Write a protein that holds these residues in place. Structure first.
Motif, PDB file in Angstrom:
ATOM      1  N   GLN A   1      45.547   3.342 -29.058  1.00 60.67           N
ATOM      2  CA  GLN A   1      46.111   4.561 -28.528  1.00 60.67           C
ATOM      3  C   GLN A   1      47.395   4.915 -29.231  1.00 60.67           C
ATOM      4  O   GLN A   1      48.249   4.034 -29.441  1.00 60.67           O
TER       5      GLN A   1
ATOM      6  N   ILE B   1      49.182   1.316 -29.498  1.00 63.41           N
ATOM      7  CA  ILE B   1      48.811   0.094 -28.785  1.00 63.41           C
ATOM      8  C   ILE B   1      47.312  -0.110 -28.824  1.00 63.41           C
ATOM      9  O   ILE B   1      46.565   0.785 -28.435  1.00 63.41           O
TER      10      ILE B   1
ATOM     11  N   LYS C   1      37.688  12.295 -24.570  1.00 64.45           N
ATOM     12  CA  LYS C   1      38.826  13.099 -24.210  1.00 64.45           C
ATOM     13  C   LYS C   1      38.431  14.288 -23.318  1.00 64.45           C
ATOM     14  O   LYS C   1      37.479  14.999 -23.590  1.00 64.45           O
TER      15      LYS C   1
ATOM     16  N   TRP D   1      45.175  16.878 -19.367  1.00 67.60           N
ATOM     17  CA  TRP D   1      44.114  16.199 -20.044  1.00 67.60           C
ATOM     18  C   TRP D   1      44.258  14.684 -20.011  1.00 67.60           C
ATOM     19  O   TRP D   1      45.325  14.112 -19.805  1.00 67.60           O
TER      20      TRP D   1
ATOM     21  N   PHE E   1      41.823  10.693 -20.688  1.00 69.34           N
ATOM     22  CA  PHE E   1      40.774   9.919 -21.274  1.00 69.34           C
ATOM     23  C   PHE E   1      39.819   9.471 -20.181  1.00 69.34           C
ATOM     24  O   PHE E   1      40.171   9.389 -19.018  1.00 69.34           O
TER      25      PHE E   1
ATOM     26  N   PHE F   1      41.830   7.614 -17.314  1.00 67.84           N
ATOM     27  CA  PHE F   1      43.140   7.068 -17.508  1.00 67.84           C
ATOM     28  C   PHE F   1      44.065   8.030 -18.236  1.00 67.84           C
ATOM     29  O   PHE F   1      43.656   8.770 -19.112  1.00 67.84           O
ATOM     30  N   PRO F   2      45.316   8.082 -17.800  1.00 67.13           N
ATOM     31  CA  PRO F   2      46.229   9.156 -18.191  1.00 67.13           C
ATOM     32  C   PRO F   2      46.629   9.089 -19.637  1.00 67.13           C
ATOM     33  O   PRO F   2      46.594   8.019 -20.237  1.00 67.13           O
ATOM     34  N   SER F   3      47.040  10.236 -20.163  1.00 66.83           N
ATOM     35  CA  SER F   3      47.515  10.360 -21.539  1.00 66.83           C
ATOM     36  C   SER F   3      48.622   9.370 -21.835  1.00 66.83           C
ATOM     37  O   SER F   3      48.822   8.999 -22.970  1.00 66.83           O
ATOM     38  N   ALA F   4      49.370   9.005 -20.801  1.00 68.83           N
ATOM     39  CA  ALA F   4      50.639   8.309 -20.936  1.00 68.83           C
ATOM     40  C   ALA F   4      50.432   6.948 -21.553  1.00 68.83           C
ATOM     41  O   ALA F   4      49.456   6.276 -21.275  1.00 68.83           O
ATOM     42  N   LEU F   5      51.370   6.577 -22.405  1.00 71.01           N
ATOM     43  CA  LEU F   5      51.349   5.332 -23.132  1.00 71.01           C
ATOM     44  C   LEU F   5      52.559   4.558 -22.656  1.00 71.01           C
ATOM     45  O   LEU F   5      53.688   5.052 -22.778  1.00 71.01           O
ATOM     46  N   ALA F   6      52.356   3.361 -22.116  1.00 71.18           N
ATOM     47  CA  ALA F   6      53.496   2.548 -21.655  1.00 71.18           C
ATOM     48  C   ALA F   6      54.549   2.421 -22.754  1.00 71.18           C
ATOM     49  O   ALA F   6      54.502   1.505 -23.561  1.00 71.18           O
TER      50      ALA F   6
END
Lengths: 222, 222, 222, 222
Positions: free
Chosen positions: C194, C215, D144, D190, D192, D217-222
């Motif tokens: 990602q 990641i 997506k 949007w 995944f 699962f959200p776009s957000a990346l830890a």
């Protein structure tokens, strides 16, 4: 000789679904196999008025109607009177896609050619030329016809442009397989076919007319 | 009139990189602008022997060398002697992709045409016809040429087949923009061009020869 | 162990040509291999100001900078310090196409990673988001990484969106091959990575900055 | 709340045509909307035995069956009990193409979900994995999901791999539009969705079973 005469009549049935809307279209017309000309009139009998431009369906309703020089093998005429089937994909540049299957069969008795079509499509954008009916006609085109000798079938390939009311060009890639209804005896070298296709529309019932002139020509370059 | 004479000479320089391998190729040859014929000889001077088939580079080395009926506007000849540039993408069916840019300029003094090319590609499979050199020649083809009137440039579109030693066909989609080096005065209606292109190879230094015949022809269908 | 430390520096050289315009870009920055983060600053030293949006070049300047769970084989780090090369095609939805090759090599001495790029493109429309600079940033994305076990290389596949100032989305298909500079010992099962990638621009000399967080994560679904 | 309970039953009807062969398939099974799991059993009642691999039809028979974190808007569940339609194109790498339309409607009375499909395809090569039945299963994938806010619909995009008995990978590009049967109130950012899909076959009557686990699962990346 293969069931055909310089002048013939045609019947067309198409069942389809575009963008989730179903419909049925029926068509009759006149054609000249050896001159490579058809002219046909179409009428929606179900699902009318179409919410998408009629242009998308035009190639969806016959290569029998191609002028072939006697030197090149005419696979389509050779398949008659039983005839042939074909399938085609349509890949539009905005991501829309359509597919068509067509069974064609000559009735020598009645000097008539029948065309049953299934036509399906999806992902035409709401805000694009097809669902907003901003298309004019298809440009002339030159198709490539390639033998798959081992299979007894032909593949066609032509990249197509639809003209827009507001000037521009809308692209569609056509890929086709043509399959005789029984085993042919000879197989053409590959070749070109040049096409011209025009639409003229017609408020009780949605109707319109199509015309096609097509001419085959050898790979050879003078 | 535009710098050209029925017979001329050409020089070709191409710098490139395919699948990470760099190379330089230099070429000279003879051509006949109005007959639409070139014949040219090429020599690798860097990176030789090429690990990929030479066929991929063939269209990478001139539309000046097209036979144009006087009725249709010849944009390429009209751009001379200063000349024109172009860019092309190549989309192969196994996922490989190439791109080319070419600057073409006529030296009237020496009756010579210069061609500088940058050619780049990637993702040719190791186990495919290009890196294993199993390609023969490109089939003849028919290209569509479309004016972008507002921009003064042309777009070309042709789907291309490379023939395989072991029988088959390997597809490549070509999309091209052609740009005169200064503003043209007239602009062609769109049209076809028919192409034939052949390779004959030649153990000291990798060399080979290419020939092209090309002829333009109007949209019109008799 | 493979030449890398939690914090490192990077140098980037890119030579390229887009739509016939050449340029050279040079870049330095800071990165955290195991956190999967780089931040880098770029400066045009030739061909500036770019007539095309800078976004197109962003993925053109390193998978070493990916956070990998220890369970999955990290091919990129494993290739270090000698490093690896890669090639990528970019297929934009309006027909433009680009290609990139990049050689990456770690200098353990100086705790620095070098990146040499060749970037080429064509057929960006004059009247489209790239040549009119109407692009914002690339959306986050999820890439698939697939082993080609027999070849010792990896293939990446991800369909990418560039956001437009005026709202919309502009698509680009990325296809990549990754090749270690010598034979690896193990080979990952395939997996996802990602990505997040952001641009912030900077009138003397065209400059800007890029940031990436990436990641890796296993095929497995809880 | 929207007609759904942790456990439900499903009915599937698909009418189709592939490579000119028609067929009808009927299916029943069990599913867990909030766990994102279905398991379903299918039976050919017309056109059996299929001359093409069953894998092509697998995604042709429901996003209701996706595990959604409460933080992200679940458009599909929100569309229930009336439900939603969708359309998808399938672009295979050997040139074959398919299209599917599906109407999905929840019967709260009977705690059952109905799925009517039309599936059509063409240009599967005779000598390729699909018509020779050399396909295994689809790899896991990450899709997506993008809002088209102005239209109230969603677009899905995922590039898919079918595994081959003889080792390799066969690619298929999926593009989907999802349309609620009436106007939704909110619209997801949007995101995944991760998918796993497996087939196990079953000599009187062609039958088989499919299983799917999917998680958003959200776009957000830890």
């Amino acid at each position: 000789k293969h069931g055909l005469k310089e002048e013939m009549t045609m019947k067309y049935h198409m069942e389809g679904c575009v963008n989730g809307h179903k419909f049925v279209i029926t068509g009759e017309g006149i054609g000249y196999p050896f001159k490579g000309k058809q002219t046909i009139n179409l009428c929606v009998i179900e699902g009318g008025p179409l919410p998408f431009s009629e242009d998308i369906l035009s190639a969806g309703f016959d290569r029998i109607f191609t002028e072939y020089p006697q030197d090149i093998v005419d696979y389509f005429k050779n398949s008659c009177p039983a005839g042939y089937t074909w399938g085609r994909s349509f890949l539009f540049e905005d991501g829309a896609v359509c597919i068509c299957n067509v069974d064609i069969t000559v009735s020598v008795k009645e000097n008539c050619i029948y065309h049953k079509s299934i036509f399906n499509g999806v992902n035409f954008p709401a805000d694009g030329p097809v669902m907003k009916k901003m298309t004019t006609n298809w440009e002339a085109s030159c198709e490539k016809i390639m033998p798959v000798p081992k299979q007894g079938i032909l593949k066609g390939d032509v990249s197509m442009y639809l003209l827009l009311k507001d000037g521009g060009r809308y692209r569609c890639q056509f890929d086709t397989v043509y399959k005789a209804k029984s085993v042919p005896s000879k197989m053409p070298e590959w070749h070109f076919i040049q096409h011209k296709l025009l639409r003229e529309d017609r408020a009780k019932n949605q109707k319109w007319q199509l015309t096609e002139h097509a001419i085959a020509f050898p790979s050879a370059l003078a």
